[PDB]
Design a protein around this ligand. Structure first.
Ligand SMILES: [K+]
Ligand SMILES: [Mg+2]
Ligand SMILES: [Mg+2]
Ligand SMILES: [Mg+2]
Ligand SMILES: [Mg+2]
Ligand SMILES: [Mg+2]
Ligand SMILES: [Mg+2]
Ligand SMILES: [Mg+2]
Ligand SMILES: [Mg+2]
Lengths: 80, 80, 134, 88
RNA sequence: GAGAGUUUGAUCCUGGCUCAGGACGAACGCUGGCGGCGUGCCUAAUACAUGCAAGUCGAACGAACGGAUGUUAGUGGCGGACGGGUGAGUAACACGUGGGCAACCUGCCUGUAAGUUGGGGAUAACUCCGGGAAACCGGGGCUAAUACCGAAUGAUAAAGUGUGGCGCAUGCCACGCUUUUGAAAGAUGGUUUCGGCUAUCGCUUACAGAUGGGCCCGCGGUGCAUUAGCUAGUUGGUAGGGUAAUGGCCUACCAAGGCAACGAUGCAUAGCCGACCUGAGAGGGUGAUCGGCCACACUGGGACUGAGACACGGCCCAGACUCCUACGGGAGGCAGCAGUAGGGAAUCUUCCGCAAUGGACGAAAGUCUGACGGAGCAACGCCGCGUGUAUGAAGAAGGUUUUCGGAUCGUAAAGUACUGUUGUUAGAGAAGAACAAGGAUAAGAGUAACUGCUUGUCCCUUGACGGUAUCUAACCAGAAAGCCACGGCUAACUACGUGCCAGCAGCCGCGGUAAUACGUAGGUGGCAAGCGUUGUCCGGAUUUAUUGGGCGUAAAGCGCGCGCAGGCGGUCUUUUAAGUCUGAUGUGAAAGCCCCCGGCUUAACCGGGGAGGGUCAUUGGAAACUGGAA
């Protein structure tokens, strides 16, 4: 850039990207653990639902996801 | 409640799955030379059970979008 | 006609022709494509200069110049007034106006705008023919 | 934000002002939500016209004034009024 | 609702061509005094020399500077998505108007209800090392938070549910039980006793609202058929995932639909509207300036960040183009304001200030703002004012002309009297300014009370324009008029010179030795700080005729039929309400046209108020006519 503040927001945005990407990937590995375990119809899936819902609502509170998305994902998972 | 749009017309085809197409046929005034013109306009009606048939008089009403084209719904079958 | 006829086809007016087609066309070297723009006057470069025999009833010699305008169109322009400064490769400014005596001329040269030096010795209508006040 | 402010109108070296409801974002003389009064600083008593019931309403909805619009309201007795309606 | 000229020997019709009006973002020619209001790259969305256009917070944080205030380069927060530009693309839910979302979001603003509990780990800055001219890059070590990450307690978030009241199928609203999740932070300030308490600015959860957006829909607005077929996730369905949210949005499987002569598809063109110009009106053309919406920021694509972007002055990558280099390697996008080149018939100052209005940040002081206020230039336009006023003759000098007597320029001049709008000189010198902050205090809600908060009244305060407008005096007619035409159309005629030559001309047409038509002089007419020409738009043009034309001979009846589609359809009864007609409600923004008031020395201009405008929509009525039905 060429303005004093643009470079600042590039820094800030790369930082936030790293953070929120990590958090999303963790959320989605959780959700995939759940859906694979639920496809296999195992014992662990009822705790994995909870892990996924924890990470969904935590992501909501962190801002990286919207609450209707979190709600919908809890609904669809609960439907398994 | 606020109220939705309702129309009446005639059925032209049945090939589609759980739906029909309702053709509305109104006279209206040509903008410049004043004559009445047969204006026609077909819509896709949401037929929950493949009830109606070709040659059927029918009433429809609008709703949320249901396909690429549909925005309406079957309300009554006024006259076979 | 019937009203149904008039609805099946509405009316269609006449296609107007301009007195001055070449003033109503611009050019851009980039696209190399003419661009319709209404213009009052254009400047050009005199290809040729000469005299004409006009129509019946008349017989006097009429001064013209074949010009290449800014937009590339080649045009015959009457040189009104007594005497002129112009010759080959002379730059000229051009307004519209039809010489009724002369077949192939449709435009005039504005006298006094550019290398078209004003008329000599004129005292009346000086704003035409482009003489200053003395 | 939603703000109550002045819309500049009139001509050069002779301003006039409409008292307007608008977003912070919109332009100075751009669009508005509702205009509810007028203002003129030229005259020995500055000439204000305000509806005051819609104005109380926009304040209850949270449309805040500017500085000069606030003090026009206060010299019209509307900010006391609005405080009086905030008392309950 | 005005017409005139032009075809003929003449006439009537037909038919074209031109003209008399109005308007321009105008240009050009001649000329040129001023004031007010406005407008000013329409062309090359061509390229950019330079400068300034987005910063702010020290009451978030740590370091450094400093003789406690203050300053900073950094981390962090908010804003950068507004404001500003242009109209490239775009023939479509892009725009207008009117609805729908039971299918959707929304930081900052307001209010209501709860809560800011305890801990952890790093990371810049910094210091070193190496690189590199230097910036700036890496690697190691140290460090703070309103930066980050955990937990407990809390969901009107999910899941299991049951009751009440309901809608428009999908469904909605309210209530309650069970289970599972989801939060935070401090800073300043006072007081107290030291524990505490506590105002404000912040933070977190939920609810409402307002504001801002999103999706869908009816209808409406462009030419071409010397463009008739188009489509293949294309159309529907069952499952699934995805978005803030519905949906082929996407995926898999099934069927083979769907659109289209009511003009699909394709080509070229164009931002759309309010509105502007014209017109008796219907309509015609335009989409400058002003406002709204849309789209796009060298071209293309893509995401991150964030409430909000797929971002004018952000990122990445590809492409074009350019600049600096120490030649190792770096940087950039004026359609931001000025400005430069180029193009073009053509369009502004590389100006002042944030005093005002408005926005960003901040507790605020304040800072930032080429938004905006203003000033500059251009007779580009609209309005206004002048460039003297009076008096003054059978009538000067001079010019033109002379029927040589006169006639005219002409009361014009001269001469006399007078004035100072303007000019100049010297003096005075408003509005616009509100405030904010701060200092006082009077009342409140809330406090253990203080601090603080809200409100009332005073004080104080800061002007770029600008010593600009405005006003007073003094002096001077003194320094301030030009352009076009004069055969008809159409206002206004003579003389000379020329001799179908030179030249004129919007149409008809002038000029070949006696030219009101050419050139010049005088005089006249029309206008006047402008006049004229050119270019474009409407009208006149009933010359695309819905209003409002026609086809024997003038242009115009397919050479004639058979006939799909469409258009149109005998008489009567019942039925409806598709069209029609009608009452109510809602809206059609402001500005602009129109009417009524007011203010600028009037005017232009500006303000206030009203009215109008829709083949607008919903709801409720009539059945005469068209249409549907028996
Ligand atoms: K599709
Ligand atoms: Mg275009
Ligand atoms: Mg007419
Ligand atoms: Mg940006
Ligand atoms: Mg830029
Ligand atoms: Mg520029
Ligand atoms: Mg003669
Ligand atoms: Mg004939
Ligand atoms: Mg209006």
């Amino acid at each position: 850039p060429n303005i004093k503040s643009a470079i600042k927001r590039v820094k800030t945005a790369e930082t936030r990207n790293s953070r929120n990407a990590s958090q999303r990937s963790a959320m989605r590995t959780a959700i995939k653990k759940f859906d694979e375990a639920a496809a296999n119809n195992a014992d662990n899936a009822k705790d994995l639902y909870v892990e996924a819902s924890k990470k969904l609502d935590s992501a909501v509170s962190k801002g990286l996801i919207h609450k209707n998305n979190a709600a919908r994902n809890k609904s669809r998972l609960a439907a398994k | 409640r606020n109220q939705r749009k309702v129309y009446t017309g005639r059925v032209v085809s049945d090939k589609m799955d759980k739906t029909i197409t309702v053709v509305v046929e109104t006279y209206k005034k040509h903008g410049l030379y004043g004559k009445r013109v047969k204006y026609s306009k077909k819509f896709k009606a949401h037929d929950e059970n493949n009830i109606a048939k070709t040659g059927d008089v029918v009433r429809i009403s609008e709703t949320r979008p249901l396909s690429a084209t549909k925005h309406f719904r079957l309300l009554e079958v006024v006259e076979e | 006609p019937t009203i149904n006829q008039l609805v099946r086809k509405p009316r269609q007016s006449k296609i107007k022709k301009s007195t001055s087609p070449a003033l109503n066309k611009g050019l851009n070297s980039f696209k190399r494509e003419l661009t319709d723009v209404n213009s009052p006057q254009k400047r050009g470069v005199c290809t040729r200069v000469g005299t004409m025999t006009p129509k019946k009833p008349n017989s006097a010699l009429r001064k013209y110049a074949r010009v290449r305008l800014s937009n590339g169109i080649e045009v015959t322009a009457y040189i009104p007034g007594i005497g002129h400064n112009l010759q080959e490769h002379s730059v000229v400014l051009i307004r519209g106006g039809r010489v009724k005596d002369l077949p192939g001329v449709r435009y005039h040269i504005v006298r006094g705008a550019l290398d078209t030096a004003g008329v000599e010795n004129r005292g009346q209508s000086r704003s035409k023919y482009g003489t200053k006040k003395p | 934000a939603v703000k109550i402010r002045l819309k500049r109108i009139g001509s050069k070296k002779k301003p006039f002002y409409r008292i307007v409801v608008a977003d912070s974002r919109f332009p100075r003389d751009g669009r508005s939500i509702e205009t509810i009064g007028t203002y003129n600083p030229l005259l020995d008593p500055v000439e204000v016209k305000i509806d005051e019931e819609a104005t109380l309403k926009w304040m209850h909805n949270g449309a805040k004034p500017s500085d000069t619009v606030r003090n026009l309201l206060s010299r019209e007795g509307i900010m006391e009024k609005f405080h009086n309606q905030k008392l309950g």
